[PDB]
Design a protein around this ligand. Structure first.
Ligand code: A1BWY
Length: 291
């Protein structure tokens, strides 16, 4: 098991400049956020780190469970396509998780060219998809269901190696149900939206990510018609549209054969009936044959 450093909260306040909320793009410390909390940049002993400060739908006890679960999963799972936890703080009424900093942020943000990063090439997108599937495969081989696969949780290091993140909702792998449905609605399998817990839902959410990679479009955009990227996929499969109509135009190296090949993988991942989807091992093989 990996051993982690227990920081005092006041130390993490110092390294994040008191959790400075200005974007790092203008010299602040804020890197991203959501319902989970906020992630900040800092330096610990010259090491660049990401500090996730958890925010309070969920009881304090429940939030503590997700904090404990992330530490337990990260203690057991070390792999080059997973992020790496360094430490944590839990003194007082705050919970912080400290990771090795990811120089290229999230896949979601690089697909939207947030803060002016250059568009990803098709060649790079294929390698990122393969890397992400390799990380999910490691998780599933070690009997963890992620439950929140999405492009915001696929991070990118300096060489754009893909790294799965956010294991606070992970569960061990009859039909297992829960009374507390969690996840990000635009990526979830239908059975996951109704309380089922199964690794086959990770495959469905990964299919949505493949659509984000092909199109450059986020899974949901309230200002778009259709708002949901899954609705766009139904227009293709019902033949009013083709996947070539939606290929990201911010690419100059997308050949149609491999694009249709990864769309084929996504379409198999997106089967409504969970038992017709490939398992992650098959998804790995299909993505390797595409390149
Ligand atoms: C191009 C640049 C120079 O600007 C470049 F980008 C800067 N580097 C970063 O920005 C950045 C750097 N290292 C991390 C990092 C490393 C390990 C972990 C683990 C965990 C968890 N657990 C979260 N981060 N992390 C994350 C980063 N950025 C995320 C973007 C997505 C955000 C997010 C997650 N979910 N949501 C929403 F869907 F809820 C939004 C969270 C921060």
């Amino acid at each position: 098991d990996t051993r982690f450093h227990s920081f005092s909260f006041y130390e993490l306040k110092n390294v994040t400049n008191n959790f400075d909320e200005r974007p790092i793009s203008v010299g602040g410390n804020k890197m991203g956020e959501g319902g989970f909390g906020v992630v900040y940049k800092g330096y610990v002993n010259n090491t660049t780190v990401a500090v996730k400060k958890l925010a309070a739908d969920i009881t304090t006890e429940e939030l503590k469970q997700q904090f404990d679960q992330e530490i337990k999963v990260m203690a057991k799972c070390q792999h080059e396509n997973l992020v790496e936890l360094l430490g944590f703080s839990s003194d007082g009424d705050d919970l912080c998780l400290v990771y090795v900093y990811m120089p290229n942020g999230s896949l979601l943000d690089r697909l939207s060219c947030l803060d002016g990063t250059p568009p990803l090439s098709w060649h790079m997108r294929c390698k990122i998809a393969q890397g992400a599937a390799n990380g999910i495969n490691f998780l599933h081989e070690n009997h963890h269901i992620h439950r929140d696969i999405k492009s915001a949780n696929i991070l990118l290091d300096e060489a754009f190696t893909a790294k799965i993140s956010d294991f606070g909702l992970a569960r061990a792998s009859q039909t297992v149900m829960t009374s507390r449905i969690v996840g990000t609605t635009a990526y979830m399998a239908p059975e996951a939206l109704r309380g089922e817990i199964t690794p086959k839902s990770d495959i469905y959410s990964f299919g949505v990510v493949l659509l984000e990679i092909i199109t450059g479009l986020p899974a949901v955009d309230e200002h778009r018609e259709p708002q949901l990227l899954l609705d766009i996929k139904e227009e293709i499969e019902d033949e009013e549209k083709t996947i070539e109509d939606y290929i990201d135009k911010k690419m100059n190296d997308a050949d149609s054969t491999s694009v249709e090949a990864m769309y084929s993988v996504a379409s198999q991942c997106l089967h409504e009936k969970k038992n017709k989807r490939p398992d992650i091992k098959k998804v790995q093989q299909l993505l390797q044959e595409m390149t």
